RNA sequence: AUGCGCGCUAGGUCUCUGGGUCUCCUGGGGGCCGAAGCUAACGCGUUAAGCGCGCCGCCUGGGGAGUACGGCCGCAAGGC
RNA sequence: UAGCGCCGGCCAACUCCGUGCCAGCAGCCGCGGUAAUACGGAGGGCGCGAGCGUUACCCGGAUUCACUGGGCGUAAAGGGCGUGUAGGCGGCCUGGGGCGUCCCAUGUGAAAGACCACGGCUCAACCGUGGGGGAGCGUGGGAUACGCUCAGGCUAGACG
């Protein structure tokens, strides 16, 4: 079970806007544009200087609630990507980065990564011309992300897919607008992702 | 010392004391109870504190100590003891799981239920 | 301990008496008596305008009352209507058709009094002691004066036994009479008792 | 320029003729995160005053670190009084293994990948004036052909 | 406390002898000070009891800074003007402002019509961005549409977070808002035109047919008198929204009104 | 309150006892300052508590306790 | 369908009421006698989430049995002192043997488990197909620097 509940409190605790809403969160109204102090009755007082636990514990909860995935699932990829070559931070991201439901919402299929969790557990997302219906899936270089034939002419895939129109999509990606699909073509660099966050805190964190 | 001394002799090991000798090697144990008598604790403190006396399932007779506010532990209850170790009282080394056997919660916890075993308060 | 008056001791040279007059035994007292009731009423009316000094002298059947002020626009009103109103006042008080003045004190981080009521107001306002003082000797410390010192008697913050603080910084000779020294004393009166505030002041020698 | 690190604020006392008198010391580390550490200790009667003097300490006393990809060129193993530090260099993606203070003092080196371990006595102080000799003790294979060869 | 800044803050505002300075929410006194030595008159609004006495304690030298106890909104900001300066020519506001009340606190100033010359003020640097955005940069919308038919903006600079010895989270800037001479486009129906200029920013990514026909009853029920109005004024809902300058939601709330007022 | 043996690491000074070519040079022993170095500190420092190698005996929080029990040795008290 | 623990420092999360060394909390330091962020209740927050806490036990932190990796002047620790058995250890130069030692080839080191790659369950768990690796021990061959050994010498230790 993920996260139900309020949101753009995750974005004031955090301090960082951290786009979770979708449309709301770019409008004068991510409520980082009016209070983005931290939520409570003690929101809006002088805090102590934060400890290094504290310091690394908030950094990985920021990248953590970034894309929505449970403790378990994060401490288990952050293990597979211990174990793997090459640095932990990029290789961890490349991780984080190859799950459905995040490439759909990258495609722009859907304007948040929760919507696109929807889509894709509700089975109008296809991969490789075959119904996936899970989240967690996790795709590789040269895939076939596409839209159910069904689904093509529902609302909500229709009107978000027309705001992509003359729209860039990341150079780890390519989308054909018209054809109600995209296709992953690499893992994605430090340098692509525009990520709030310094993962070496999040290393230094599961080191204890 | 040198490598001879180590190899005609050696190190010997550390062998841990265990601190709850009447659980025998098992998490919890049933009692039944003979004594409720209130104690004073060790110095720095000064209090009244509920304690029953536990004859075990084992051979072993020891002092408890009940958790909470009030209870209902007489002359005759049934008990299960939990290991855990008072600061205070000296020679207690055991704790009564609250609401198991003739032990009930108390009453009108709303905070740590988990503990002081009490059912949730049915709200309306 | 028990200091004797900085000012008591230098009234002879560095320092001036407050009240320069002259009058035989037949007439010094009633003129003692007319000069401490117009030192209370000017003590007690233009205490908001951050009163310093008092200086009254006499020629013949007159009275010269000059008023050294921190803020001498709160004393001459709009119009010159509150001045005229304390003349009035005044010489109600004695027909002795008084002639009030108006100063302004330069640089009034300069004047011990000042300094001492400012450190008294602010023990009222429940304030922290020992960093109000540290602030007025600094403030006092900036502006020259090439020595300062704040006393605060005791019962501080509420609390049940009483206890004195003293900030001070640089050159205070007390033992010097070519010292001019200038001194201020004030009282802070709290819920929980009274507050004894005492400033010294040390600007250059001879 | 100089960024600031603190580590320990402590109030030691001394006896009078009737009472104590108080004086805080101040442990401060002083780095650009380019291979500049400074480490500072400061007594005065007065916390801000002591942080201001660690601070001065800190800017004199200078070490220049042979940082290359943000680790250490060889491991190191130094004693200081009653207390050891273990520095070993680490690849890439690793971060800083380090106690409060080694990490304190090697994150204003500009070091990203390093092990590091605390034997003996764990008094902060010496754990801080070990780590500095340690630092202060390091050679490249520049530094050390140019010593042999010439 | 923030240093010489301040005093940077009042260099941006360029208030003499000749000028009476309105402060909002002063808190400590810091930047009042630093206004009361170079300004004529000071006049300031607090409302906190707590912080009352340090502001009254940091305001003791001083003599021309008046302080009263009243919500900002709640009292007539016009008569505070005309008793507290009646001997100065500019009369301009200086402020920094909490979170929740930075753009309503605006409005309210802008709204009553006020002699004022220029507002220059301390904001989050969003907000700053949002107030004086040019057309299609994704900061024009509501607010720029506003303040821009009001008062001309001016962002000077941004103050980085690593200013205040406490660190925020979102960083700063300062801006200026200068009183336009008059209404920046004639329109008769102000009430309309804000109806009409919050409505066609509902939905930033979608057209303006799309923001224009879903609000309001009456022009969710006659479409197609929206569409010829458009083409009347030589706009159209297709562009995008965003890309269109003041001028021209001047001359459509003009139209598309006067279809129907 | 410092196990035994050997090798290396500035000196100065006071002594006891031999040899020489005899202001001095060279061995063995007993003290006092002190290089390098070691030590938590006190201090040690060519008679090491320095730098190394070899072999042996010991320590693993403080009371209970050098106690109880068992064993060995003593006439005994006692000892291990 | 959303619960459970926590919010004095370790250790991330703060205020108001009730009690006044009482009721209690407690892993340690300790909090409780009228201003309790440490007890009890609320509001709020933090962590995890179909789970969350507690007890018991094992490894770690413990370099706190120290081979890697400790010590014995005063912190616990040099036998009261000799002589000496077994045992441990041992100068310089040549030559043989090749026991320790090192290298190569090879048999074994089963299957599952561990690592890497690729695949089947719509993914994962789970499973399958390959690739290695592996301390040790056998068998054959090779090298002689060091240790052991045998033979011949030398005088710097030892002895006369
Ligand atoms: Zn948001």
Request: with cysteine.
């Amino acid at each position: 079970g993920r996260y139900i509940g309020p949101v753009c409190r995750l974005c004031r605790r955090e301090g960082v806007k951290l786009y979770l809403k979708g449309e709301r969160c770019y409008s004068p109204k991510c409520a980082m544009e009016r209070r983005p102090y931290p939520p409570g009755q003690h929101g809006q007082k002088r805090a102590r200087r934060p400890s290094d636990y504290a310091v690394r514990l908030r950094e990985k909860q920021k990248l953590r609630r970034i894309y929505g995935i449970s403790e378990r699932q994060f401490r288990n990829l952050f293990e597979e990507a211990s174990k793997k070559k090459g640095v932990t931070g990029s290789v961890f991201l490349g991780l984080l980065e190859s799950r459905l439901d995040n490439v759909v919402y990258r495609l722009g299929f859907a304007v948040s990564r929760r919507q696109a969790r929807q889509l894709v557990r509700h089975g109008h997302i296809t991969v490789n011309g075959r119904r996936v219906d899970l989240p967690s899936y996790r795709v590789r270089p040269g895939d076939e992300i596409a839209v159910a034939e069904k689904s093509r002419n529902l609302e909500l895939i229709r009107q978000n897919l027309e705001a992509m129109k003359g729209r860039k999509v990341g150079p780890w990606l390519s989308l054909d607008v018209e054809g109600m699909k995209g296709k992953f073509l690499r893992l994605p660099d430090r340098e692509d992702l525009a990520l709030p966050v310094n993962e070496q805190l999040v290393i230094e964190f599961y080191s204890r | 010392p040198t490598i001879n001394q180590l190899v005609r002799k050696g190190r010997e090991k550390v062998r841990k004391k265990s601190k709850v000798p009447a659980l025998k090697g098992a998490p919890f144990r049933r009692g039944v109870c003979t004594v409720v008598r209130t104690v004073t604790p060790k110095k720095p403190n000064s209090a009244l504190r509920k304690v029953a006396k536990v004859r075990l399932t084992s051979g072993y007779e020891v002092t408890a100590y009940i958790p909470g506010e009030g209870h209902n532990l007489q002359e005759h209850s049934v008990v299960l003891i939990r290991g855990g170790r008072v600061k205070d009282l000296p020679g207690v080394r055991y704790h009564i799981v609250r609401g198991v056997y003739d032990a009930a919660g108390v009453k009108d916890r709303k905070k740590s239920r988990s503990k002081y075993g009490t059912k949730k308060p049915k709200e309306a | 301990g028990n200091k004797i008056h900085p000012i008591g001791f230098r009234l002879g040279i560095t320092r001036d008496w407050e009240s320069r007059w002259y009058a035989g035994k037949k007439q010094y007292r009633h003129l003692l008596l007319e000069d401490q009731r117009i030192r209370g009423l000017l003590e007690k009316e233009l205490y908001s305008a951050g009163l310093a000094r008092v200086d009254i002298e006499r020629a013949a059947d007159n009275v010269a009352v000059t008023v050294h002020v921190a803020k001498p626009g709160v004393v001459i009103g709009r119009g010159g209507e509150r001045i005229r109103v304390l003349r009035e006042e005044l010489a109600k008080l004695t027909g002795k058709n008084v002639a009030l003045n108006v100063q302004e004190v330069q640089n009034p981080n300069l004047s011990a009094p000042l300094v001492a009521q400012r450190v008294a107001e602010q023990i009222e306002r429940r304030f922290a002691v020992r960093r109000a003082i540290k602030q007025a000797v600094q403030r006092v410390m900036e502006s020259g004066a090439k020595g300062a010192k704040v006393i605060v008697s005791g019962r501080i913050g509420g609390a049940e036994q009483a206890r004195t603080e003293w900030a001070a910084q640089g050159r205070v000779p007390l033992h010097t009479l070519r010292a001019n020294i200038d001194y201020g004393f004030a009282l802070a009166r709290t819920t929980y008792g009274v507050l004894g505030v005492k400033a010294y002041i040390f600007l250059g020698e001879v | 320029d100089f960024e600031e690190k603190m580590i320990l604020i402590r109030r030691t006392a001394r006896m009078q003729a009737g009472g104590r008198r108080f004086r805080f010391g101040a442990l401060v580390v002083v780095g650009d995160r380019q291979g500049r550490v400074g480490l500072g200790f400061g007594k005065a009667p007065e916390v801000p005053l002591a942080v201001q003097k660690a601070g001065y300490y800190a800017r004199r006393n200078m070490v220049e670190v042979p940082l290359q990809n943000g680790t250490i060129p060889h491991e190191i193993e130094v004693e200081f009084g009653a207390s050891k530090i273990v520095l070993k260099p680490a690849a890439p993606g690793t971060g800083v293994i380090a106690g409060a203070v080694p990490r304190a003092i090697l994150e204003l080196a500009g070091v990203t990948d390093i092990l590091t371990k605390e034997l003996g006595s764990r008094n902060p102080i010496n754990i801080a004036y070990a780590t500095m000799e340690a630092l202060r003790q390091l050679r490249t294979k520049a530094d050390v052909e140019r010593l042999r060869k010439g | 406390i923030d240093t010489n800044i301040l005093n940077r803050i009042v260099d941006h505002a360029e208030v003499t002898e000749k000028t009476g300075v309105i402060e909002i929410g002063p808190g400590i006194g810091a930047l009042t000070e630093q206004l009361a030595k170079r300004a004529k008159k000071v006049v300031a609004f607090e409302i906190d009891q707590r912080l009352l006495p340090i502001l009254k304690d940091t305001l003791s030298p001083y003599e021309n800074v008046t302080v009263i106890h009243q919500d900002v909104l709640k009292a007539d900001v016009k008569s505070v003007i005309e008793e507290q300066f009646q001997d100065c020519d500019e009369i301009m506001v200086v402020a920094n402002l909490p979170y929740y009340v930075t753009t309503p606190i605006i409005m309210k100033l802008l709204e009553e019509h006020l002699p004022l010359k220029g507002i220059v003020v301390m904001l989050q640097k969003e907000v700053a961005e949002r107030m004086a955005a040019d057309p299609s940069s994704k900061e024009y919308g509501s607010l720029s549409i506003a303040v821009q038919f009001y008062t001309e903006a001016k962002t000077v600079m941004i103050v980085p977070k690593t200013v205040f010895v406490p660190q925020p989270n979102v960083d700063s800037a300062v801006i200026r808002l200068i009183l336009r001479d008059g209404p920046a486009v004639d329109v008769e129906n102000e009430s309309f035109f804000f109806q009409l200029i919050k409505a066609s920013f509902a939905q930033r990514r979608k057209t303006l047919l799309n923001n224009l026909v879903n609000n309001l009853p009456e022009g969710k029920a006659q479409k197609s008198t929206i569409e010829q109005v458009l083409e009347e004024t030589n706009i159209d809902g297709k562009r995008r929204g965003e890309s269109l300058s003041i001028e021209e939601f001047a001359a459509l709330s003009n139209g598309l009104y006067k279809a129907l007022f």
